[PDB]
Amino acid sequence: MNATINDDDIDDVKKALDHATQAAHKAAAELTAKLRSDFVEYGNGGTAGQVLIHIYGPGLIYGFSAFPVQIRLEIPNQPVPFNKVHITEVTAYVIDENNRTYWTRVWNSSTFRQGGYIADTLDLVTVMKAPDPLVYQIRDAIVTGQISRELYDKIWNTSTTHFEIRVIVKGYQEAWKTDSSVSNQSSCPSDGHWYEDACWVHDKDIDFTLKAETTTAWGHVTGTNDVATIDGGMLGSLPIKFLQSLDLSGKWVLYQNKYAGALSDFIIITAASPVHVLNSTAMYKFLITPNPGYFQPANPKISDEYRFVTLRVIEGGRMELADTTTGHIGDLTEPTFFGLTAHYTDAPGTLDYHALGLVYAYVERDDGVKIPIWLAAEPMISVLSNTYTVMKDQDVKNLIDLYKKKDREKINATTKAMINSLQEKIDEAEQLLAKAKGMNNENAIEYAQGAIDEYKAAINDLQKAAQQDDYQMFLNYLNAAKKHEMAGDYYVNAARKALNGDLEQAKIDAEKAKEYSNLAKEYEP
């Protein structure tokens, strides 16, 4: 079908979907690949000692995730075959810049070969995690549902802590000498060893404590989630006209999400309705997926608890819990979907709503210790307010029909009528520009002016539209004019949000503006 009445030329519209499942899975797969790591040495022991120590972890750790750590112990060969190295206890842990230690893991002598080792290599695998300031606040948030603007900002502004891993190996080496007083294997004691025509016997045991540490381990962690983009995931909301579109009822789109927390461990994919307007309803569907074999060669179980919410943002910037779903997953061995229905109830003072998902789980390390992880993922939606569309589809359809009926006088009447309405929308954009300048809010200023320029472009396209006698050219100008109005509508949403304490959602609206404005210009000569 068409661009001009249906807006089938809008890229967001071309991404709609009858069903969200397989696209969700795809997105998950795609995102997981982006987060796949290779092992890198984090550091090693002094290259002396009855044991060489090497530490390995991922090349990339996203945010506050837990991660597999490999420790490799080399027993170098000995001049004496029986001079076996025994390992009695290996201990690893994370240490912060205040000599505070976390997640200490201990392998006791039971773990190792009774007879000791000579010329050999040993691989130890464990799971670790840096310091995590937010974890318990997120856990509370999930349980009680109480989420303030304070916590909320804190989620996106807290940084990863500096840390290092250190390992301690303990045990003893056997020392053996030849017992010069034995002449024949027969006379070489049962415990001794005949070997190279001499009878070797066990002299002493020599203790060691070896210790290795990493350097700039924390340098493998990244905070920038820009890495976490899905191809074609959406931002914001389709223009409000799409509320009366049966064509789009019951359709989904994947949304880009903003992430914080243990993104390397598991992920959340968001599919939702593509339209979000005050006093209207939207569907959300969240996929929670463990991030496949990120802990390889380790294989810890992971399990538990979530809360998906919408948060009403009050003018000024305060937030309050709106619609919410919460429960337990058990073991997240398989992807699972969770739904949330948002009704964007409008009350005086209501600015907009945000959607957020919080998950809290435990990675259970083979030693039984349980390490808490959390994820926060915010669908990059935007809730629009009613801006009173001037170019309703019906009216656009009438106008085109007039063109065919050759009724240039009615085309003229209508154009003029529509232009009055846009002039009015401009008058209000001018009021926003005023407040924006008054409160010295740079962004609102830019947005409000943007709105004014968009509406102005639309008014101009309507003027030219009425004078066309090529058909496509008449369509093209109506279509440019339509998208320009949509762009201006976004800008106005943006300014309004900027002015009242939601600059984040404002930036989404403003970006959508730039997009529809550019789509418009593709139709202008």
Side-chain angles (χ1 to χ4, degrees):
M1 268 65 68
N2 67 80
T4 182
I5 299 183
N6 274 49
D7 313 289
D8 287 309
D9 57 323
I10 300 180
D11 228 276
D12 300 315
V13 174
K14 298 184 230 131
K15 295 176 206 171
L17 287 176
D18 312 284
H19 305 287
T21 330
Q22 283 332 280
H25 284 134
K26 275 287 300 303
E30 172 189 352
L31 201 59
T32 283
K34 286 191 170 78
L35 302 175
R36 210 204 86 262
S37 216
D38 268 329
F39 275 110
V40 165
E41 216 199 19
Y42 276 23
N44 49 58
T47 55
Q50 303 92 325
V51 188
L52 272 298
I53 314 189
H54 297 269
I55 307 171
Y56 307 90
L60 182 91
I61 307 181
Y62 181 102
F64 298 98
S65 328
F67 51 88
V69 171
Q70 264 173 288
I71 308 156
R72 176 195 214 81
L73 311 185
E74 319 153 18
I75 325 300
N77 215 329
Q78 237 66 56
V80 195
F82 323 72
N83 281 177
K84 290 171 175 183
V85 171
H86 291 249
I87 313 178
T88 319
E89 174 205 78
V90 181
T91 283
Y93 54 77
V94 160
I95 177 178
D96 66 20
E97 73 198 40
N98 314 300
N99 295 112
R100 201 170 170 224
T101 62
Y102 322 58
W103 307 126
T104 318
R105 212 296 196 185
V106 157
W107 295 269
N108 64 20
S109 65
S110 284
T111 305
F112 304 107
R113 187 151 288 162
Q114 315 285 43
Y117 297 93
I118 185 141
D120 219 343
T121 290
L122 303 188
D123 286 341
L124 293 169
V125 177
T126 198
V127 187
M128 295 282 135
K129 185 192 175 196
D132 195 343
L134 292 193
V135 60
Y136 299 134
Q137 315 197 60
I138 301 290
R139 195 211 39 241
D140 301 342
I142 285 161
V143 169
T144 76
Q146 313 166 8
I147 309 165
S148 62
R149 184 67 190 265
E150 287 57 65
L151 172 60
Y152 172 92
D153 297 328
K154 199 177 180 186
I155 292 166
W156 315 112
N157 300 131
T158 302
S159 295
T160 51
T161 310
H162 277 170
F163 72 98
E164 298 284 345
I165 305 177
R166 81 161 53 126
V167 188
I168 298 187
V169 193
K170 295 185 181 178
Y172 64 84
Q173 192 171 9
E174 294 182 53
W176 289 64
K177 332 287 175 170
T178 34
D179 182 333
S180 210
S181 84
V182 166
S183 44
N184 54 317
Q185 321 187 4
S186 302
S187 301
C188 190
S190 57
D191 52 311
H193 298 300
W194 190 267
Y195 171 90
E196 291 198 14
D197 302 323
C199 170
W200 295 75
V201 68
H202 182 216
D203 185 33
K204 57 204 176 167
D205 288 335
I206 306 158
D207 292 350
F208 61 86
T209 287
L210 299 181
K211 142 198 172 66
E213 178 175 310
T214 56
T215 326
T216 317
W218 55 264
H220 296 105
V221 183
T222 182
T224 183
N225 59 340
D226 307 18
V227 183
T229 287
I230 56 173
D231 296 322
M234 215 197 62
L235 298 163
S237 173
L238 280 169
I240 64 179
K241 73 135 227 153
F242 285 97
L243 272 180
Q244 300 107 15
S245 275
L246 285 167
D247 228 336
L248 257 44
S249 67
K251 298 217 180 328
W252 309 83
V253 284
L254 291 192
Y255 267 87
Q256 299 296 332
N257 281 99
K258 208 205 332 175
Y259 296 101
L263 189 63
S264 296
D265 302 343
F266 64 106
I267 81 189
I268 295 184
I269 292 313
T270 297
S273 320
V275 206
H276 305 272
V277 191
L278 287 181
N279 277 336
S280 224
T281 294
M283 311 280 79
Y284 292 76
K285 220 180 197 277
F286 302 91
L287 188 45
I288 301 182
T289 327
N291 168 347
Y294 171 71
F295 295 97
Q296 278 312 87
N299 188 39
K301 63 158 212 212
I302 308 176
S303 31
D304 222 31
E305 190 175 23
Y306 66 87
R307 190 165 213 115
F308 297 97
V309 308
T310 54
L311 299 176
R312 177 165 39 258
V313 174
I314 298 295
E315 286 164 3
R318 193 181 86 261
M319 290 179 173
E320 43 193 42
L321 180 56
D323 308 332
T324 174
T325 184
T326 199
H328 289 281
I329 305 157
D331 298 287
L332 36 172
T333 65
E334 34 189 24
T336 322
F337 284 98
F338 300 87
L340 180 50
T341 292
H343 186 79
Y344 301 127
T345 304
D346 196 0
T350 296
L351 181 71
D352 65 44
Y353 288 72
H354 285 232
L356 184 78
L358 305 182
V359 192
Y360 177 85
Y362 293 94
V363 174
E364 203 222 333
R365 209 160 54 169
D366 55 353
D367 70 339
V369 161
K370 275 151 196 63
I371 305 181
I373 49 174
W374 65 272
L375 187 74
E378 167 176 359
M380 295 292 276
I381 55 103
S382 170
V383 178
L384 303 166
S385 69
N386 185 355
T387 43
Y388 315 110
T389 310
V390 172
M391 321 220 48
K392 302 272 179 34
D393 301 340
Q394 195 46 64
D395 303 16
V396 169
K397 190 205 146 212
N398 307 319
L399 213 38
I400 296 172
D401 287 337
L402 298 181
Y403 180 90
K404 294 165 175 176
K405 295 177 46 63
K406 302 259 203 61
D407 194 351
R408 308 304 298 209
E409 179 198 26
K410 278 200 184 74
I411 283 161
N412 280 346
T414 306
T415 306
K416 180 189 186 310
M418 274 164 170
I419 286 160
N420 277 343
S421 285
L422 293 171
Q423 262 154 0
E424 166 61 352
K425 282 158 86 87
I426 286 181
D427 289 344
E428 293 174 39
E430 294 281 19
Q431 278 168 177
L432 284 180
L433 186 48
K435 304 202 192 196
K437 296 226 289 269
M439 312 285 306
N440 190 26
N441 185 313
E442 322 276 295
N443 314 254
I445 293 172
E446 295 209 25
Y447 300 156
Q449 188 55 52
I452 298 178
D453 304 332
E454 287 305 306
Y455 291 141
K456 278 212 224 247
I459 290 187
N460 189 65
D461 288 340
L462 287 174
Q463 297 274 12
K464 306 198 193 300
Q467 298 157 16
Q468 297 310 309
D469 57 343
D470 177 70
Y471 182 53
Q472 188 64 67
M473 215 59 232
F474 174 73
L475 288 190
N476 285 348
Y477 271 116
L478 286 180
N479 197 241
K482 205 183 179 194
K483 320 299 209 229
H484 279 312
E485 195 207 350
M486 288 164 164
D489 287 340
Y490 281 129
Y491 271 130
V492 154
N493 278 273
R496 180 182 59 95
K497 279 153 182 188
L499 288 172
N500 299 67
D502 192 352
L503 177 50
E504 304 94 345
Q505 194 165 291
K507 292 176 144 181
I508 290 159
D509 290 330
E511 159 68 27
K512 294 312 275 179
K514 183 66 205 308
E515 285 174 13
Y516 284 60
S517 175
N518 297 164
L519 181 48
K521 304 182 184 295
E522 284 168 11
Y523 295 95
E524 301 163 350

